C-alpha cells in the first residue's frame, strides 16, 4: 500500500530535533509531507516563506519528503495530501493529547502517531533557541549551519 | 445542610466540557454558581458580557445554577456567595495545584474540589476551539449550537 | 439536601494526610464514610480489623464520620451507603484517573471528587511510612501517636 | 512499500482498548503482528496459551492481523517479523519512554510509534479489570463478551 | 574546595519560595550568586533595577549571597562568576529539563542542581502573585513585607 | 568549606547512568559517598555484597568517591557521613518528591539535590536491564563490561 503522512508544525526554525523526526518518519512512510503552519497567532520570528526556505534547504535531499506551507485548517491540509497519518514529536503532553483527541473528531479515519527523536535532541526547545540567537549566542548545537545563517541575518536585520 | 459551590473560569466560550461539569457539580451541591472571571490579562475573545450571555443561554435551564461575572478577586466572589467549595475541572495540573494551594491560605475554610468531565470531553482545548473558529472551521463537536452562532458572528465581525 | 460521600482506601495505616482529608471532606458533606478496603492483593501490613481500629481511634471524635470495612466491590459499598460522591486525595495520577474513569461506567450518577491535603501532608508516602517503621524509625511526623503505637507493636511482634 | 508493525504487550487479557489500537494500527500498516509476551515475571492471570486464544477469538476477523506469542527478547521477535515499527498505546509514560529509548540502542532502524485509543477506552486499566473480575464484578464495559467468559471461567476455577 | 553556585531567575518579584531556596542553597555552597535576568521578552512587571533592589532588601543579610543582574546569556554570567553549579527550584518540569539539557551542551562542566523549597512554599506562583496584587489583594503570605510595599507602590503608580 | 554528599540507591546493578551521576556529583562535592541500600523488600537480583563489589570495580578509580553499604535508615547513614547533601538522579518523580519531602522532616538541615545524567543515559531502566539480562540479552549499552560479567555469571548460576 501507499501511505502519506503529514508532519505539521510552526518550525520557527526547523531544529535538528525536527530534522531527526523527518529522517525517521520518512524511512517508514512512502511520502512524508512537512506542513509548515502559518501560525499567525504565535507571532513567529521568521515569516512563512522564510520558514519554508529554511526547511527546504535542510530537507530537500530526502527524496520522499515534501515541504509545504498551509494557512488554513490542518484538516484541509491533511485531506489535500491524501494523508492517513499525522506525525508529531513527543519529548519526555497537554497540548499534544488535546490536539490528537480533537483530531479524532475532525479527522476520524486519520491516525496521529507520536514519535520520539534521538537522545541528543530530546531537550531542544524552540523558544530557548530563538532567545539565545536573539541575544547573540550560537545555536549550532541545536540547528544546522544553514539555519544558523538565517538566524544571524534576521537578528542583525532586527537590531 | 445547604452547600453552595462556585465554579469559576474564563469561559471564552463555555464548551461542552464546562457544561458537563456544570451538570455533574449541580447534581451534588445545592447551588452551583458559575463565576465568569473578567480575565482582562488573558485578552479574552469574547467580552465579559458576551461570555455571560453565552453561558446563560446554555445553562439557564438548570434550576440551581446561577451564572454571574466577577471583575475582582476570587476570594471576594466566593465569600459573596457564601460558598465553601470551589469546583475546578481536571483533564488528564501545574496551574490548578498552585491556585488551590494559594487558595488554602487565602480561603482557609473553603475546599477546592476537582472534578473530571465525561470521556468524550476530556480533550477539548479552549485555545484550539478559538483558533479553529477563527480559521472558519466548525467547532460544533466541542461547543453547543448556540455557542457556535456566537463564534461565527464574532469571527465575521472581526474580519 | 443530604449528601453522603465515601472516602475509600487501603489505609495501612491511616496517616496525618488521610486524617486531614477526612477533616476537610467531613466539613462539606453531611456524612463522610471512611471505607477501609480489604486490599488482599496488596498484602497490607495491618489486617483489615487492625486498620479499622487504627482509623476509629483517630477519627471517632468526628460526629459525622463513619469508619467501615469492605471486602467486595467499591460499587457495592458506595450503593450501600446511598453515596453520590467518592472522595479521593490528590497530591502533586495514573491510577486515580483510571479508577475515576472506570467508575464513570460502573457508577454513572456518582461523582468522584478529588481533594488535596494541607501543604505539610503533601509528601507523605504510606510505603515510606511502613518501611521506616519496619526499620525501627519513628514516623510521628507522618502518623498520630496512636498509630505509631500500633506500628511499634506490630514491628516488634513481626521480629 | 510493505511495512510490518509489531504491537507487543502482556494482554492479560486483551481489553477493548487494546482491540481499538489493533483496529487503528492495522488500517495503517500492511501487516500488524500482535505479539503476546510471555511476561513470566509479572505473574500473568492467564497463561500465554490462554492469552493467545483470548486475543485470537477477538482479532481473528482482521485479515492483516497476526497474533503470536514470544518468550524471548522483543528484539528477536521484531527481527523475526521483518518489522520496522513497534506500536505502543499511550493514554494520558515513564515505562514507555525508557522502553523506546532503550530500543533505540537495541533496534536502531526500528521506529517506536505511539498511538492513542478512542476517548471511551482512555481510562481502562488491566490491573483494575482483573481485580474487578476476581471480586465477581462484571467488566463487559472494558473487555468483549468472549473475554468476560474466559475471566468468569478462570475466577470460578481459581476459587 | 571553593564552589560558587548561580541561582538565576526573573524574580518578578522575589517570593518567599525564592528566598527559601536562597537560604538553603547558600548553606551548602561557599558563594551563592542570585542572578536577576533582564527577561525583556517576558515583559516583567518590575524593571531590572527594581527587581535588584527588591531582592537586595530581602537577601542582603546573608553574608555569602550576591545579588547581580544580567542582560546577556546565562553562559556569560555563569563563567563570569567562576561558577560550576546552576541552582534551580523544582516544585511538584518541561522548561527546566530543556534548559538543563541545553546547558549541558553550552556549559559542559557546569552542573545544574535542582532543589525543592519547604512545604509551605511549594504552591506559590509568580503569575498569581502579580495578578492578585494588580487586583488590590494582599500577597503577604507569598512575599515578604518589603516586597508587598514595592507591589503596592507600583500598582498604585500604574492605575 | 568541606561538603560531603551522599548518593544513595539500590544499585542492582550500577548502570552507566548511575556512574555518570557519580562522575558529575564528585566533581562538585569534596567527598561523594555512594550508599548502597540493602533494599531487602525490593528483593534485589544481586546481594548487598555483590552490589558493593560491582560498584567498587567501576568507581574505585575516582579518588573522592567512597562506596559503602547500609542496612538501616538513610538518616543514620547520612549523619554517619557528616553529609549535608543527598544527591538523587532525575530523568524526565512521585517517589523522589515524597522521599525528599519526608527527608525535610527527618533531616532538616540536609539538602536533597537533584541531578540529571547525560542525554544518552536518560532512558536506562534498571528493571529493563535485569529483564534483558535474565533473558540472555546483552546490556553493554547500559552497564560497563565489568557489570555485564557479573550479570552473565548470576544469570548462568540461576538457571
Ligand atoms: C502548527 C500546529 C500543527 C502545532 O505545531 P507546533 O506549533 O507545536 O510545531 P513546532 O515547530 O513547535 O514543533 C513541531 C513538532 O515537533 C515536535 N518537537 C518540538 N521539539 C522537538 C525535538 N527537540 N525533537 C522532536 N520533536 C520536537 C513538536 O512537539 C511538534 O510535534 C498547529 O498549530 C496546527 O496544526 N495549526 C493549524 C490550524 C489548525 O487546524 N489548528 C487546529 C489544530 S488541532
Ligand atoms: C478564571 C480563573 C478562576 C481561572 O480559570 P480559567 O481561566 O482556567 O477558566 P477556563 O475557562 O479555562 O476553564 C474553567 C475550568 O474548567 C476546566 N476545563 C477546561 N477544559 C475542560 C474540559 N474539556 N472539561 C472539563 N473541564 C475543563 C478548567 O481547567 C478550569 O478548571 C482565575 O483566573 C481566577 O479565579 N481569577 C480571578 C482573580 C483572582 O482572584 N485570581 C487569583 C486566583 S488564585
Ligand atoms: C482501596 C482503593 C479504593 C484504592 O485506594 P488506595 O489503596 O489507593 O488507598 P490509600 O490508603 O493508598 O489512600 C487513600 C486515599 O488518600 C490518598 N492519599 C495518599 N496519601 C495521601 C496524603 N499524604 N494526603 C492526602 N491524600 C493521600 C490516596 O491517593 C487515596 O486517594 C481501591 O483498591 C478499591 O476501591 N478497591 C476495592 C474493590 C474494587 O471495587 N476495585 C475497583 C476500583 S475502581
Ligand atoms: C510486554 C512488553 C512489550 C510490555 O508490554 P505491557 O506488558 O505493558 O503490555 P500491556 O498488555 O500492559 O499493554 C499493551 C500496550 O497497550 C497499551 N495500553 C494499555 N491500556 C490501554 C488502553 N486502555 N488503550 C490503549 N492502549 C493501552 C500499553 O501501554 C501497552 O503499550 C515488554 O515487557 C516486553 O516487550 N518484554 C519482552 C522481553 C524484552 O525484550 N524486554 C525488554 C523490553 S525493552
Ligand atoms: C531567567 C531564566 C534563568 C529562567 O528563570 P525564570 O524566569 O523561570 O525565573 P523565576 O523567577 O520564574 O524563578 C526562579 C527559579 O525558582 C523557581 N521557583 C519558582 N517558584 C518557586 C517556589 N515557590 N519555590 C521554589 N522555587 C521556585 C523557578 O522554577 C526557577 O527555577 C532564563 O530565562 C535565563 O537564564 N535567561 C537568560 C538568557 C539565556 O541565556 N537564556 C538561555 C537559557 S538556557
Ligand atoms: C535506596 C533508596 C535510597 C532509594 O533508591 P533507589 O532504590 O530508587 O535506587 P536506584 O538504584 O533505583 O537508583 C539510584 C538513584 O539514581 C537514579 N537513577 C536511576 N536511573 C538513572 C539513570 N539512567 N540516570 C541517572 N539516574 C538514575 C534513581 O532515581 C535514584 O535517584 C531508599 O530505598 C532508601 O534510602 N532506603 C533506605 C532506608 C530508609 O531510610 N528509607 C526511607 C527513605 S526516605
Distance CA E121, CA E144 (A): 12
**CATH number for the domain including F65?**
3.40.50.620
Residues counted in chain A: 159
Residue C156: Cβ within 10 Å count = 9
User: Is C111 at the interface with chain B, CB within 8 A?
Assistant: yes
Q: What are the chain E neighbours of C119 within 8 Å (beta carbons)? A: 119-120, 122-123
Answer yes or no: is D125 a known binding residue.
yes
Residues 6+ apart with CB under 8 A from A72: B135, B136
Final resolution, Å? 2.1
Nearest to E85 by CA among B139, B75, D48, F85: F85
Distance CA B91, CA B121 (A): 9
Residues 6+ apart with CB under 8 A from A17: A89, A91, A117, A121, A122, A124, A142
Q: What are the chain D neighbours of B91 within 8 Å (beta carbons)? A: 92
Task: Say if residues C131 and F41 touch (Cβ distance below 8 Å).
Answer: yes
The SS3 call for residue C106 is helix
Residues 6+ apart with CB under 8 A from F70: F8, F35, F36, F37, F38, F76, F77
Distance CA A59, CA A64 (A): 10
Whether B90 sits inside 8 A of C114 (CB atoms) is: yes
Domain that holds residue E147: 1-159
Whether C3 sits inside 8 A of B28 (CB atoms) is: yes
Q: What are the chain F neighbours of D102 within 8 Å (beta carbons)? A: 123-125, 128, 141-142
The SS3 call for residue E154 is helix
Strands A31-37 and A65-70: parallel
Which residue is listed with cell 472558519? Answer: B136
Q: Which residues of F8-17 are buried (b: 16+ CB within 10 A; e: fewer)?
A: bbbbbbbbbb
Q: Ligand 6 mean position to F134 CA, how many Å?
A: 22
Ligand 4 atom 32, closest CA: D9
Grid cell in block for residue F10? 539500590
Across the interface, which of E73, E98, E105 has its CB nearest the CB of A141?
Answer: E105
Q: How many CA atoms lie within 13 A of E140 on its CB side?
A: 5
The total number of structural domains in chain F stands at: 1
Residues 6+ apart with CB under 8 A from B71: B38, B48
Distance CA D84, CA A14 (A): 26
In chain A, DSSP finds a helix count (H) and a strand count (E) of: 6, 5
Neighbouring subunits of A (3+ Cβ pairs under 8 A): B, D, E, F
Task: Give the method of determination.
Answer: X-ray
Q: How far apart are the first and last CA of chain B?
A: 51
Answer yes or no: is F51 a known binding residue.
no
Q: What are the chain A neighbours of F119 within 8 Å (beta carbons)? A: 119-120, 122-123
Which residues in chain C precede a discontinuity of more than 2.5 Å between C and N?
A: 92
- CA distance to partner chain F, nearest, from residue A122 (Å): 8
The SS3 call for residue C136 is coil
Ligand 3 atom with the shortest distance to the CA of C103: 44
Nearest to A33 by CA among A1, A58, A69: A69
**What are all long-range contacts of C99-103, with beta carbons under 8 Å and residues at least 24 apart?**
C99/D125, C99/D128, C100/B116, C100/D123, C101/B116, C101/B119, C101/D122, C101/D123, C101/D124, C102/D123, C102/D124, C102/D125, C102/D128, C102/D141, C102/D142, C103/C74, C103/C75
Best of B125, B155, B158 to disrupt the A interface (most A CBs within 10 Å) is B125
Which residue is listed with cell 538518616? Answer: F75
Grid cell in block for residue A19? 530534522
Grid cell in block for residue E104? 549541558
Residue F28 DSSP class: T
Chains B and F touch (3+ CB pairs under 8 A): no
Ligand 1 atom 26, closest CA: A89
Amino acid at each position: 500500500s501507499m501511505v502519506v503522512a503529514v508532519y505539521p508544525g510552526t518550525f520557527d526554525p526547523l531544529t535538528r530535533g525536527h530534522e531527526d523526526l523527518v529522517r525517521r518518519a520518512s524511512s517508514i512512510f512512502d511520502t512524508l509531507v512537512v506542513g509548515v503552519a502559518d501560525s499567525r497567532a504565535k507571532k513567529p520570528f521568521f515569516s512563512l516563506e522564510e520558514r519554508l526556505k529554511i526547511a527546504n534547504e535542510v530537507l530537500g535531499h530526502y527524496p520522499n519528503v515534501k515541504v509545504m506551507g498551509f494557512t488554513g485548517l490542518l484538516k484541509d491540509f491533511v485531506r489535500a495530501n491524501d494523508a492517513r497519518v499525522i506525525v508529531r514529536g513527543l519529548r519526555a503532553f497537554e497540548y499534544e493529547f488535546q490536539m490528537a483527541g480533537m483530531n479524532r473528531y475532525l479527522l476520524p479515519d486519520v491516525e496521529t502517531m507520536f514519535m520520539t527523536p534521538s537522545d541528543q535532541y530530546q531537550f531542544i526547545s524552540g523558544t530557548i533557541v530563538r532567545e539565545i540567537a536573539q541575544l547573540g549566542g550560537d545555536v549550532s548545537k541545536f540547528v544546522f549551519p544553514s539555519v544558523e545563517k538565517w538566524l544571524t541575518e534576521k537578528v542583525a536585520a532586527m537590531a
